[PDB]
Amino acid sequence: QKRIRLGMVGGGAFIGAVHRIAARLDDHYELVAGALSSTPEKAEASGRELGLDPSRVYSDFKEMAIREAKLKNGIEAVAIVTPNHVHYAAAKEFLKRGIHVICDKPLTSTLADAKKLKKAADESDALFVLTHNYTGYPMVRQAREMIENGDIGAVRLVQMEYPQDWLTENGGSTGDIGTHAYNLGCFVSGLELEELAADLDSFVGGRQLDDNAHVLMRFREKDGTRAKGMLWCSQVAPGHENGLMVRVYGTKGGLEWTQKDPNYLWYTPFGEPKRLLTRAGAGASPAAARVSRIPSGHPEGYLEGFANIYSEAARAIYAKRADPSVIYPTIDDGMRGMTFVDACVRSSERNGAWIK
Template structure:
């Protein structure tokens, strides 16, 4: 049996619990170190609750990176689950220590920071996974494969929407409402970047220019709680993106529709076990996870027989499992894990959205990195 990969964690909260569950699901990782809080008592309490060696519970990430790198039994990879403004400095400390990184999105709070991390990853030869977990769903991978095979024909339209309601009233923002901690984008940086990545991953098409409108509905809020854009793709396709955290009745309604000259696809994150496919002129089909016609990419991301639902945690765990394969030098199917380049391109999208909205919707080209 392959030994689990030694992993550490910086940060905590809700997403910390999600990441730890994802790490455990397939037995690929063992959590052995962490910096869960800068407060010594909280750090010790968190470490004790996770049955960690007290000597490997830290109160700052710099010390953790240095000491773990110096140990023969040190961690191989670190998981970063902190507010956005800390992603880049924490990732930098561990990359420079030669430790692989799993980072919550967004990669940083600016494209400049993200590009600096990209250079560090290449210089130190480490791997970085960005947890855009929706790309771990089997249905999403099946949609990507169908498009790559040309099943839809020439792509014409891409529509992606992400609606939530938890910011419909003032006072619930937490650190996500503080530009110093969250960065310059609110709903756009929190869920808009997920919507962008889902469309980007499935279609494989890059946005050429976009016309954006960001708005803040709740009085006193410093960051956007709504964003929308018209999209023009480099191959001539057109698109639309809309994200809102002030839409009552919506929890995590992330939906993607892609239409081509020969057919269309529709995915709904709240019903993730199915992909809806319409071949032009034929009845609408429900393609079940692990059902007839499944391919290598989506079968590899499916753990249970069709009809036994899999969802958010399994998709999250799939990224961890695929990253474990990559760290071990194994070869999973062609699934294109979200990495440091994905993070840079995502920040280029965010900054183009901000610039366009500030210019009254002027068509703006994302400054995607080039080699």
Template sequence: MTAPIRIGMVGGGFMGRVHRMAQRLDGEYQLVAGAFSADPDKARSSGEALHLDPDRVYTDFATMAEREAAREDGIDVVSIVTPNHLHAPIARAFIEAGIHVICEKPLAVSLEEALSLRALVKKHGVQLLLTHNYSGYPAIRRARELVRQGALGELRLVQVDYAQDWLSEAGNEGWRGDPTLAGPAGALGDIGTHAWQLADYVVGQDIETLSADLHTFVPGRQLDDAAQAMLRYRGGARGRLSVSQVSPGNNNRLQLAVYGSRGGLYFDQESPETLWFAELGEPMQRLSRNGPGSGPADQHASRVPAGHPEGYLEAFAQLYRDFACHLRGELPADVTLPDVDTGCRGLAFVEAMLASARADSAWTALAYPEE
């Protein structure tokens, strides 16, 4: 029987809890160390709550990386769940210590930082997973498979929308409202990177140019709380991306529609058990997760039979499970995970959006960094 992968965590909060649940779901990981706070009392109490050895509860990530790398039973992987500005420094410390990295998105606060991490990953021979969790949904795996099989024909239109309402009033931003902690993009960096990655993962075509508009609706806020863009793909398709954290009535409405010459598909993250698919001239089909006609990609990402709902946590756990398979050399050949290259592409998208917005929505080239 394969022993669980020893994992550590830097950071905490809501996303820390989500990551720990995802780690536990399939029994692939065992949390053995962590740097949950720079405050010694908070770090200690967090470690006690998680039943960790007090000697493996740290107050800074640099010490954790150094000491865990020196232990025979040290961690194999670290999970980074901190504000954005710390992603790159923490990842750098553990990569240089020879420890694999699982990092919250975005990978860094600039493309320059992301590219430096990519160079380190290749230099030290470690692996990095970026937790764009929506690509863990079986329905999204199936959508990607349908596009690659040519079921939609020549792609024509890509539409992705992500709406939330939790920033409709001032005062809720926390670190996400501080450019020194979140980076130069607000809603764009927080959920816009998710929207971009979801479309990029399913469509499989690069954006060539974009025209972006970023806006801050709430007075006094330093970063954008809404962003929109028109997209031109290299394959000839046209697209639209819209994200907002000031849309009352929306909790986490992430939707993707892709249309081609022979068919179309539609996915709603708040109803993740279903992928809607239509062939031209035929009625819309409701494709249920792991249901009749499901393919290898859908089945690989499903845990229970159709009709037994899976959702957000299972999608998160799927990335963790796939990363464990990847580290063991057992990942199916047709499964692609968001990695350090995805992180670099995402930061290139963010910087092109910012440049276009600064130029009054001028069409701006999106130059993805070579892999």
């Protein structure tokens, strides 16, 4: 197959560098165009910095979808990587015109925009991929499989967290990290959240947005058990760089995974010794392998994870010219995300009331 002609909006900036890495890694893409800043001097510079044909460097995402859709050489797919109050204005321009969009988390900035974009995205024939990179890890996907086959039986408990420390001093945590924890939660567990209760705080004086969240969680009944969970996210917890973690408890055993040591999945069958499952090592399931690149003991990590999303989206894109083993996060996952955030905010404002 011919590499996918890829554009970018936003970037210039870790998150730009990450997406561009994610797309070089498995060599499924070539990055040929970009509107990476709204103020032209900066755009032109950034293109200059990436080696982009200046023919091919814009400063208007709207201008850039119009021309590129005409171009015979035009982009086949676009990574949207603006701040999220702009995800919707941007993606609808490309989806509108048959260009696949690979969008960064969370979906939007408001529930209103989330709903519109779904509609846009649903109307289009172009693919729409949401980049929840953490569902991308081999061991995270193995968990999903294991649980789907009932390796720990009915789910009773889903315990989820995501503390960081970077705002100890000096849109909030629920929307930025909280949603990842939530989405990681449902992805692994196979459950639907039915209702939640949230206590949010902005600890850091001067700060209007929530920088910590405690959330009680009630799940829809699957398999005769009505699962519960909790969720914590925080940006004021010294000692934590990026400690996303998920813990699942069934009627037959448990599964523990920590993003910071991603190559490990802790599996304990009830009545048995806990077993340490490894990426690419024994016990590694099919679903894990399909996104593994190197031998056991040879640490894959965050970028390899992000790339897993770009590679699946690719396998799908090709099939727009589809393998049922291909997974990636959808507009409905992002749909769910925004409902989650809205409801946390509504809850805490209503003093911890249950919301669905």
